[PDB]
Amino acid sequence: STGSATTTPIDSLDDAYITPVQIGTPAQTLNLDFDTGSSDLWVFSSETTASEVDGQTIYTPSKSTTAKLLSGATWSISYGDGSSSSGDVYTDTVSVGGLTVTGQAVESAKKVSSSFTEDSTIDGLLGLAFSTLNTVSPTQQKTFFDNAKASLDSPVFTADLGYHAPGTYNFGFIDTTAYTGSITYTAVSTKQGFWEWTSTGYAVGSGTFKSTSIDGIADTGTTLLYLPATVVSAYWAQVSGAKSSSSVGGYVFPCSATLPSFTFGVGSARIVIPGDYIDFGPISTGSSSCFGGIQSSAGIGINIFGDVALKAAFVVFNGATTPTLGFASK
Known part of the structure; x- marks a missing residue:
């Protein structure tokens, strides 16, 4: 298999790039920040503290027929800029650019720090570093790429970010x-x-x-x-x-x-x-x-x-x- 998705700058400075990701059945499309420096896939959700949501699209696991609570699992992450988020975990079907992973850990935010709340364009992160950094406890979870790898034509992904323009993330081919x-x-x-x-x-x-x-x-x-x-x-x-x-x-x-x-x-x-x-x-x-x-x-x-x-x-x-x-x- 392969996948291919367009990634788009969130603002005129290229401060970050967002890529549409389909989560659940029927699909709920959220725009995630693909992050090769972290290893959690986490989303704003119906569980996020209401005062901490300001314009983001949320994942509602109760509306997904394929969502399952990962019982007892929690997550909590802090990033290099001092921002942070935490919550519980579901497994669900996740597709990026036509590439589908079943049973992906989708980390549902109960709390996010102010910098996430204040950025209405980013609905969550999709980590693409190595799964040894994943924060889910007590059972660490695999990244989307790790879960997809065996199915991919080649065990690779590529980043082609644009300057003041959209670019592309490809999975499974060069x-x-x-x-x-x-x-x-x-x-x-x-x-x-x-x-x-x-x-x-x-x-x-x-x-x-x-x-x-x-x-x-x-x-x-x-x-x-x-x-x-x-x-x-x-x-x-x-x-x-x-x-x-x-x-x-x-x-x-x-x-x-x-x-x-x-x-x-x-x-x-x-x-x-x-x-x-x-x-x-x-x-x-x-x-x-x-x-x-x-x-x-x-x-x-x-x-x-x-x-x-x-x-x-x-x-x-x-x-x-x-x-x-x-x-x-x-």
Whole structure:
């Protein structure tokens, strides 16, 4: 089997991408944030505290003839930005782009933190990291990809995120028309539960490539590119007037600036992020200070190749017995 679904930016900045997912019988379609940096599929639901729902589409398990409470199971997750959610668990049929998994754990939120409530465009998350990170207790549950893998033509999924435009998540096949040149594959460590890999270095604009190992995770659920302070300082030093603002929480730059591109290495290959991809617009409405798309990871503990980086590539998440990542230009 295969599946193919369009993923669409939630706003004009590409802050996140939502993909329609069919849950239950008859289908209830929710728009989920596919997140290669987590491993829970959780949804706003008829069980979510009413004051914490503000415009989201909800899953109502009592209206699904295939829903079954997973007795005794609970979940609770906290994300890198401090947001969180928790609840109980049903199993149900879940389809993405024509690919169907029966008995998928659908984690129904009883509580969500304010940042989720305040975002009416995201009805939940669909985690695509390794199932060892799944938070369901006392019986950990498998991700949608893990459940689908055996049925897929090939045990892979691909992320093709658009810049200010829709893109595609494919399951079970590699669309050879969707990228240019060749895909370069690179080793993955699953020891922390993530799609963790080592970039071979970087360049700023037309500058020379610096060969240096940068360990980080491929995370579709993170907006920006978080890299070591040395690398980030080298980038912003090429933007007149750019500075790190403690009050804003990162590097800002004059909205009148033209940003240089940023290249990262994948083995001997190079992925070029155009400068425009690094512009996240005014810090507040009407400001002439703009927020940068490349930020320091120093306070995170891990480097993160988020959407800023991934949208410049066609990315293969190869879930073979020894997982690997593939990157191609597009």
